[PDB]
């Protein structure tokens, strides 16, 4: 989880701010066992409105 935050921090500053989710369930999936690419796509969808 810590590695994911740093990777995201390197690129996508706006995303970093959005990373501050009020729900732990979103990050729970990572713990269960998933890659950053898969997690990012799901999250990116929420910002797809932009």
UniProtKB/Swiss-Prot annotation:
Induction: Mainly expressed during the logarithmic phase. One of its GO terms (biological process) is defense response to bacterium. It is found in: Secreted. Has bacteriolytic activity against Gram-positive bacteria B.subtilis, L.lactis and M.luteus and several species from genus Staphylococcus including methicillin-resistant S.aureus, with MIC values ranging from 0.11 uM to 7.8 uM. Has no activity against Gram-negative bacteria or fungi. In vitro, has a dose-dependent cytolytic effect on eukaryotic cells. Coiled coil: none annotated. It comes from the Bacteria. It comes from Staphylococcus pseudintermedius. The modification N-formylmethionine is found at residue 1. Highly resistant to proteases. Thermostable. Retains virtually all of its activity after incubation at 100 degress Celsius for 3 hours. Signal peptide: none annotated. GO terms for cellular component: extracellular region. Keywords: Antibiotic, Antimicrobial, Bacteriocin, Cytolysis, Formylation, Plasmid, Secreted. This is Bacteriocin BacSp222.
């Amino acid at each position: 989880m810590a590695g994911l935050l740093r990777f995201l921090l390197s690129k996508g500053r706006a995303l970093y701010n959005w990373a501050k989710s009020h729900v732990g369930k979103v990050w729970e999936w990572l713990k269960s066992g998933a890659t950053y690419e898969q997690i990012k796509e799901w999250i990116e969808n929420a910002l797809g409105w932009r």
